[PDB]
């Protein structure tokens, strides 16, 4: 379940084999956060904290959220993230090496000191000679590479320096990446510090990106989880970075479910809530070949416009409650395969909690009087009045 | 001497690039006896939209250029990175190749001649053939499903009437990627096309008014009607309405090989064809 608002712990009071995350860090350690034993009983005592690493993001992932525009800046981004497993980080200096000892300091800036030898440690780094490290450097690391990428030049006796014109053609990069690593509300979302393990062989993006997605959908078949329903929470994020997030995670689904394939995977039921503000080419994988790999959806949404037409006509059943606007009605019309233009009509004025359904399951179109739910969401009125007197 | 190429725009060995350019230009140096892989477009696009003169009598990579021709090489590097894209498309290279310039058109003719069948005189192995396709993402579809029919067509028109074998061709899914010159002549070269598919409003109305026969089943959508109502000839609206509520297995069929409208109850097939995809209770159910 995907929760935005987070309403949905205290619908599954009383069901074995649930889990309940929320996204963010803790206020403070000392806050109570225990686990649960296997066959017990869900009670509203219990809950998880997680943020989301930097690196699960990958080389193409993290080429969107940057967003090279204009002059030598794709190149420079390119020739920074093919380097990261020979950078180091000790104190506060970032630094090269090579295989007898020597080292050499890195600048943000355009410091002129000991700028004679650097084509060459350049070139030797772009031809993989230099040695190479076992730790994931931090995120704000990719500023001061792309800046010596960018501020190299020739100089006229026979050596090295940093030019000033080299500079102006990458400047706006460098000037969102360092706004975006010093912003309150993305990185309590976002692990920017590294710190972890990265292994040798040339294939240390797929295991970042696979044990997040291990994580967040659950393992193959085969293994053994841990929980049957999982409700992450998401009431910490800001409206500006959700897309650009969620986005991310559900694109990173779909290509361990291709390398997964039809032999090991195990059906799933996904939930997604107020799908209009996310699921806006390479962005529609899961939609499309979601039942080749045993993954279905359900959408909902109040603004069924703002979604496209390629996506609400993949559906074989459809629920509809009250919807007023003509720019919605004209969608449902135009999108929909099953039905009759005689049952439209009663959907401008249906009662609260009156729905009309008809699809595949339904031999012929019903309007149905929904039950309610006991115990039913943590959803409620914020009241004024009360502490007003 | 050689002469290295680069795909950014660093600075070595940039004073002597026209000179080498224009010879090339002109045909004037030697040739190789392999294929390059695809990936060697995206340096020769930008060095051949970085060449600048420089002021003291040499050559220059401006940044300037640059800009111009970045969202190119910026499509050509994308695509051979995807996995799913270099997994249909063998991009690596190392073939062989020969002089006078008939390398495009040899690999050409031998994939159209193993998806398509040879021609007229020559023993041929199969008789039906079957590409299964499911393995190919619904992004791609359009791309290279709309090209192999149309290199297909290329060689048909050079090839002649004389010389081809009559065949029948069935697609389905058409809406995906049909959406004009093949169906125009396909009647000389013995060209039968049967398409199959479910949003006939999706398509080039050339294509459906250039039939001859028409089955349909139930249709329930306005738009979808009005599409056969156009492909047909007037004189017929009594017929039109039974579609709205046709059930399970029957059709309406009208054309040339039918006297009048007729409405048929269809056979089953025996044995037919992949029953379904998975089913949710059966994996849940297996404690």
Excluded at chain 1, 167 to 185: G, H, M, T
Excluded at chain 1, 243 to 251: F, G, I, R, Y
Aim: charged share 25%; aromatic share 10%; with cysteine.
């Amino acid at each position: 379940i995907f929760d935005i608002n987070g309403e949905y712990a205290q619908a599954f009071t009383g069901i074995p084999n649930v889990k309940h995350t929320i996204l963010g860090e803790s206020p403070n350690v000392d806050s109570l956060e225990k686990k649960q034993q296997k066959g017990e009983l869900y009670s509203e005592e219990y809950y998880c904290y997680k943020k989301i690493p930097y690196q699960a993001l990958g080389f193409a992932g993290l080429i969107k959220l940057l967003r090279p525009s204009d002059k030598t800046q794709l190149p420079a981004l390119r020739n920074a993230l093919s380097a990261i497993n020979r950078t180091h980080f000790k104190s506060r200096n970032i630094y090269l090496e090579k295989d007898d000892g020597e080292t050499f300091l890195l600048y943000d800036d355009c410091r002129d000191t000991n700028q004679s030898k650097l084509a060459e440690w350049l070139d030797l780094l772009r031809r993989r000679r230099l040695k190479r490290t076992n730790v994931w450097p931090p995120f704000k690391s990719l500023a001061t590479l792309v800046a010596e990428f960018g501020c190299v030049a020739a100089d006229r006796s026979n050596g090295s320096k940093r030019d000033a014109f080299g500079f102006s053609n990458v400047l706006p990069l460098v000037k969102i990446i360092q706004q975006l690593a010093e912003d309150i509300r993305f990185k309590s979302i976002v692990n920017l510090n590294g710190g972890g393990e990265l292994a040798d062989g040339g294939t240390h993006w797929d295991k970042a990106m696979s044990d997040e997605v291990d994580y967040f959908f659950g393992k193959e078949k085969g293994q053994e989880n841990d929980w049957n329903v999982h409700i992450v929470n998401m009431k910490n994020l800001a409206q500006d970075h959700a897309p650009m997030l969620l986005s991310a995670l559900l694109e990173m689904f779909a290509e361990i479910l291709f390398r997964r394939g039809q032999e090991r995977s195990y059906p799933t039921v996904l939930l997604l809530e107020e799908a209009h503000h996310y699921l806006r080419k390479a962005y529609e994988r899961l939609a499309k070949e979601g039942r080749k790999f045993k993954c279905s959806l359900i959408v909902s949404t109040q603004r069924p416009s703002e979604l496209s037409p390629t996506v609400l006509a993949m559906c074989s059943n459809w629920f509809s409650l009250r919807l007023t606007n003509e720019r919605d009605l004209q969608a449902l019309r135009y999108a929909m395969e099953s039905g009759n233009e005689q049952i439209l009509k009663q959907i401008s004025g249906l009662p609260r909690g009156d729905a009309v359904a008809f699809g595949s399951a339904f031999n012929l179109p019903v309007r149905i009087s929904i039950n309610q739910a006991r115990p039913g969401p943590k959803s409620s009125d914020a009241v004024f009045s009360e502490e007003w007197a | 001497e050689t002469f290295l190429l680069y795909d950014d725009c660093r600075d070595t060995n940039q004073s002597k690039l026209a000179e080498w350019l224009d010879l090339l230009r002109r045909r004037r140096l030697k040739r190789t006896n392999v294929w390059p892989p695809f990936k060697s477009l995206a340096t020769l696009v930008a060095e051949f939209g970085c060449v600048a003169a420089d002021r003291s009598n040499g050559s220059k990579r401006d940044a300037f250029g640059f800009s111009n021709v970045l969202p190119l090489v910026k499509i050509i590097q994308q695509l051979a990175e995807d996995i799913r894209f270099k997994s249909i498309v063998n991009l690596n290279g190392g073939g062989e190749l020969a002089d006078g310039g008939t390398h495009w058109d040899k690999a050409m003719s031998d994939e159209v001649d193993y998806f398509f069948g040879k021609e007229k005189g020559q023993e041929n192995d199969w008789n039906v053939h079957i590409v299964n396709m499911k393995n190919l993402a619904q992004d791609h579809a359009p791309m290279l499903l709309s090209a192999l029919l149309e290199m297909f067509a290329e060689i048909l028109f050079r090839r002649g009437q004389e010389r081809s074998y009559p065949t029948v061709l069935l697609l389905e899914e058409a809406h995906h990627y049909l959406r004009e010159r093949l169906a125009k002549e396909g009647r000389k070269f013995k060209c039968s096309l049967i398409v199959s598919t479910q949003r006939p409003s999706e398509l080039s109305p050339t294509v459906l008014a250039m039939c001859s026969n028409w089955f349909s089943l139930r249709l329930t959508n306005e738009r979808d009607l009005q599409a056969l109502r156009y492909a047909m000839e007037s004189g017929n609206e009594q017929i039109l309405k039974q579609i709205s509520g046709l059930p399970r297995g029957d059709a309406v069929a009208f054309g040339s090989a039918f006297n009048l409208p007729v409405r048929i109850s269809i056979n089953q097939a025996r044995p037919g064809p992949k029953s379904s995809d998975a089913v949710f209770s059966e994996e849940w159910a297996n404690c």
